[PDB]
Write a structure and sequence with these properties.
This is part of a larger assembly, with two copies of chain A. By secondary structure, the first copy, chain A, is of the alpha+beta class. Chain A is built from one helix and two strands; from the N terminus they run αββ. The first copy, chain A, has one helix at residues 2-21; strands spanning 37-40, 48-51. A two-stranded antiparallel ribbon of chain A has the order 1-2. The A-B interface holds A 25-27, 37-41, 45, 48, 51 and B 43, 46-49, 51, 53. Chain A: Residues 1-21 form a coiled coil. Chain A: It comes from Vibrio cholerae serotype O1 (strain ATCC 39315 / El Tor Inaba N16961). Chain A: Belongs to the bacterial flagellin family. Chain A: Heteromer of multiple flagellin subunits including FlaA, FlaB, FlaC, FlaD and FlaE. Chain A: It is found in: Secreted; Bacterial flagellum.
Chain lengths: 54, 54
């Protein structure tokens, strides 16, 4: 179980790392700094869609 | 004869008025064109995908 715990904490750091490395060119998709962002997908203004990545 | 000469000047004056009109219309086309450009890329920045540097 001690050896297994070392594998668990190894994968545990992996889950934390992927939450901080995935960026998409300087952003932070899964860090939680990605608040509600609206994408303007209409000819005029106002008809955007919010996307949230927890 | 006075009326005939006055009409000859009149078409000259009126044509001058037309030329001033199209000269303004020449810049009219461009200011509209660049304004359309202003609207296009503001919509490009109206979304949350791009970062602050963009």
């Amino acid at each position: 179980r001690v050896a297994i715990q070392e594998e668990i904490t190894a994968l545990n750091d992996e889950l934390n790392r992927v939450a901080e490395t995935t960026s998409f060119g300087g952003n932070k998709l899964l860090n939680g700094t990605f608040a509600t962002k609206s994408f303007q997908i209409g000819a005029d203004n106002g008809e955007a869609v919010m996307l949230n990545i927890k | 004869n006075v009326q005939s000469r006055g009409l000859g000047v009149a078409v000259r004056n009126a044509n001058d008025g037309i030329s001033m009109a199209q000269t303004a219309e020449g810049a009219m086309k461009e200011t509209t064109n660049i304004l359309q450009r202003m609207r296009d890329l503001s919509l490009q920045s109206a979304n949350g995908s791009n970062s602050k540097a963009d």
